[model samples]
Target: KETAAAKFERQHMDSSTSAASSSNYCNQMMKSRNLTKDRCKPVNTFVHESLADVQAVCSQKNVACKNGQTNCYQSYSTMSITDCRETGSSKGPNCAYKTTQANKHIIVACEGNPYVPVHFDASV
Candidate 1:
């Protein structure tokens, strides 16, 4: 009799099934755990590319994107911002808010036939 781990490895280790299928499985697992994929969920983040385009969005009077501050940047976009530091830089005493309060979707552009998105809303 095969153990659960062995069974999982077997069903998920077949290269003949194609890498795309395997990747899809991984994504599904992540979604199930609420680990990644932002399906209309209001999560907080600070590392959105759109925010980078708008510098003033992060340039608020009391809002500073500190290197390690939690409330420094509140994001409505699905960005993988571990912290404000991960999104913006800290050059002075004030924290430069790099993220904004905009509801945005995260898209992963693929270049190959079975292109995969490096970042997903759920993963953010």
Candidate 2:
């Protein structure tokens, strides 16, 4: 079974790739990464940073999650990230996306015994 921390890495981490340079990045990644299952994910993000740096965010400044959860933390440093938004042409099986790269302080929800990132709450 995939743990939440590992799930987060699969869904969000993309350290191997250079900063997103092409618009098709999301279109390809969202599907290849298995985020487009029964339905296309409306929006998702990929962080181009080290796993250790990302994990360290748990100890950053605390913040309220978009859902009003208090377990979220905001990264102290701006991180390279790619935001994948479902395109207007996106259909059931053919998921399309608009990829936008930006440097932002990410907000994530953390949990578990050792306290690690579990969900990408948002990026600011």
List model 1 lDDT by residue over 1-124, tens digit each. Answer: 8543333223222222212232133333323334233332222222224323222222222222233332232223443322111123432332222222233433221122222221222222
- lDDT value for model 1: 0.28
* Predicted model with the maximum TM-score: 2
Most accurate candidate by lDDT: 2
Q: After superposition, how far is residue 77 of candidate 1 from its true place, in Å?
A: 12
Query: In model 1, what lDDT does residue 13 have?
Result: 22
Q: What's the residue-level lDDT of 120 in candidate 2? A: 98
In model 2, which runs have C-alpha deviations exceeding 4 angstroms? none
Q: Distance from true position, residue 28, model 1, in Å?
A: 28
Q: Could you give candidate 2's per-residue lDDT for residues 1-124 as a string of tens digits?
A: 9899999999999998758879999988998789998999999999999999999999998999999999999999999999999988778888889999999999999999889999999898
User: What TM-score quantifies how close candidate 1 is to the native fold?
Assistant: 0.19
Residue pairs in collision within model 2? none
Alpha-carbon local distance difference test for all models: 0.28, 0.93
User: Cα deviation in Å at residue 68, candidate 1?
Assistant: 36
